[PDB]
Each structure stands twice: as C-alpha cells, then as structure tokens.
Design a protein around this nucleic acid. Sequence first.
RNA 1: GUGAAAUACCACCCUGGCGCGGCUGGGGGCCUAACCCUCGGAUGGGGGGACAGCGCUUGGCGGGCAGUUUGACUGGGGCGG
Length: 133
Amino acid sequence: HGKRYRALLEKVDPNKIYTIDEAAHLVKELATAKFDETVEVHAKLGIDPRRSDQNVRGTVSLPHGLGFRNDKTGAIHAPVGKASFPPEKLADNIRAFIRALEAHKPEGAKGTFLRSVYVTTTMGPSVRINPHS
RNA sequence: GUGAAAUACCACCCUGGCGCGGCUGGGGGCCUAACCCUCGGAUGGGGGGACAGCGCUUGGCGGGCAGUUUGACUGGGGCGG
Ligand SMILES: [Mg+2]
Ligand SMILES: [Mg+2]
Ligand SMILES: [Mg+2]
Ligand SMILES: [Mg+2]
Ligand SMILES: [Mg+2]
Ligand SMILES: [Mg+2]
Ligand SMILES: [Mg+2]
Ligand SMILES: [Mg+2]
Ligand SMILES: [Mg+2]
Ligand SMILES: [Mg+2]
Ligand SMILES: [Mg+2]
Ligand SMILES: [Mg+2]
Ligand SMILES: [Mg+2]
Ligand SMILES: [Mg+2]
C-alpha cells in the first residue's frame, strides 16, 4: 500500500474490540482522501446465502439524504451518504441504518448475525466497532 | 465497449495455498530415571524401557463355565396337522 494509511494505521487499532460512539468520530479523519469521501461501515451475517428463502432486500432511504442487499457469499454492504455529514453527528447515524437491518432479519437464519462490523470508508481501514454500544 | 459484472485507493466476505502464532489432535526416532528382567559384587553394573505390567474405564470375541427356555390339542407319545 501507500503511506496514506501507513501514516494512519498506528492511530487506529484493529485488534481490541471497540464500540460505536467512541469509534464513530474518527471516520472522516481516518480518510486522507483528496476528494468526496463516502463512508461505508459493514458487517457480514451468519445466514446461509445458498438458500434464497433467507435473503433480505428493500429500499429505505436515510433521513439525512444521499448527498440493502445480501450477496451470495453472505456479507452486507450499503452507502450511508456523501462527504457532507460531520464527525460528531454519526453517533446518531451510525446506529440509524444498523437498526433497519434486523427488521428483515430472517427467522430460519441460524447463528449470531451482526458478526464483525468494521467501521470503514471507501478510502479507509479495518477497525473494530461494536454494532450496539 | 458485443456479452450483461468493471478492471482505482479500500475495507467486509467466498474458494483453495503458504506463512506466523493461539488452543492443539496424530505419527516417528533417540535418551534414562519410573516400571520389568538380570548381575558371586549392588546407595551400583548390564538388558528391555516409558513400551510391558498393574488400576479405572470402552467396545468386542467368548459352551471354557453358569443360570435357564425349549407351548398346547392329540383315539398313547413322537412325526404330521
Ligand atoms: Mg532405546
Ligand atoms: Mg538402564
Ligand atoms: Mg538394578
Ligand atoms: Mg539398573
Ligand atoms: Mg540402556
Ligand atoms: Mg502402559
Ligand atoms: Mg450349558
Ligand atoms: Mg453364547
Ligand atoms: Mg435341558
Ligand atoms: Mg401334550
Ligand atoms: Mg379322540
Ligand atoms: Mg387307541
Ligand atoms: Mg400318536
Ligand atoms: Mg408338530
């Protein structure tokens, strides 16, 4: 890689599990990008994609504005916006969409579901965050 | 742009691979000091050796033994029915 996140990886730690509100505020400072940062935080899920009965879909737009689908490998992705929103508001938006997921969580789906959510951007790292606290 | 999927820095995952480490399971070899055998001698020497033996536990083979079962009707009983 470059020195983009080799300047930035000694301040942000993947090893020791973290929670949202303390690890939420660093998402715009962790991206050294030149342009237009669109943050994406994600976790994979414990449902077997090999059966379509357990899949999940929809379109639910976020309150704040532009600026959910599971794959066949069983992870989850979604855009939360554009550069736009600041660092301290996302404790409000970092628990926002994350509670729209579990709405359509399947019943015959087996296992702990939000597994490892790593707060990231298009431009950014692996850092542990709790889905809840 | 004629394949529908886009060839960026990223993370989050699939599949096989190596790499380190964490809990590890399995194999091999050598060693002696437990344990076993032995030695005119021994707090020692030689041999076998963590096997074997012995305890607890697992499943198996098991008339060598043990306890028993092996029906009634019936022109006697069995055989047949
Ligand atoms: Mg030897
Ligand atoms: Mg010896
Ligand atoms: Mg001796
Ligand atoms: Mg000896
Ligand atoms: Mg020897
Ligand atoms: Mg033994
Ligand atoms: Mg008998
Ligand atoms: Mg018998
Ligand atoms: Mg008899
Ligand atoms: Mg009779
Ligand atoms: Mg008669
Ligand atoms: Mg008669
Ligand atoms: Mg008769
Ligand atoms: Mg008869």
